[PDB]
Design a protein around this ligand. Structure first.
Ligand SMILES: Cc1cc2nc3c(=O)[nH]c(=O)nc-3n(C[C@H](O)[C@H](O)[C@H](O)COP(=O)(O)O)c2cc1C
Length: 148
């Protein structure tokens, strides 16, 4: 039950760093972790064979909530990923200057629920430089593991 997939959409590297930090935590605990940039993936069957899936995505939009561009195709085809009955958790970087702080995380969680996923922990929301939140990131990964 030890295969974890992490897929991240990141433009300035913050959610990517967050993904790398989570990946190390899971690997140290005994998971086999496959980490992929969303730009490199196709949605159809993306979750097949994974016991745990973690989705990371930063939040954008001039005057609306928009997902990071590389993640949008995955979100638009999320119903083809194999999410039904899948244990999933979400994370993302943002900036609390914006009212909808890490709003991409909400959008992804809400769709995953409709699609039959089991959300194993509330999404991780990181404000500003994620290296300043390293302890929170590692703690969230630990908490995700404990809720499996
Ligand atoms: C036009 C623009 C819109 C943004 N909108 C939001 C937002 O609605 N909510 C939020 O939390 N952060 C928002 N951000 C902040 C980014 O998500 C933040 O820079 C984040 O660190 C980027 O993470 P990444 O490097 O993983 O892509 C916005 C940034 C820009 C430039």
């Amino acid at each position: 039950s030890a295969k974890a997939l992490i897929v991240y959409g990141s433009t300035t590297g913050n959610t990517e760093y967050t993904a790398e930090t989570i990946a190390r935590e899971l690997a140290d605990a005994g998971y086999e972790v496959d980490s992929r940039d969303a730009a490199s993936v196709e949605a159809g069957g993306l979750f097949e064979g994974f016991d745990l899936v973690l989705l990371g995505c930063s939040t954008w939009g001039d005057d609306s909530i928009e997902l990071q561009d590389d993640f949008i195709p995955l979100f638009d085809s999320l119903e083809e990923t194999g999410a039904q009955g899948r244990k999933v958790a979400c994370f993302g970087c943002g900036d609390s200057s914006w009212e909808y702080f890490c709003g991409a995380v909400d959008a992804i969680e809400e769709k995953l629920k409709n699609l039959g996923a089991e959300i194993v922990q509330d999404g991780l929301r990181i404000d500003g430089d994620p290296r300043a939140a390293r302890d929170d990131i590692v703690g969230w990964a630990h908490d995700v593991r404990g809720a499996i």
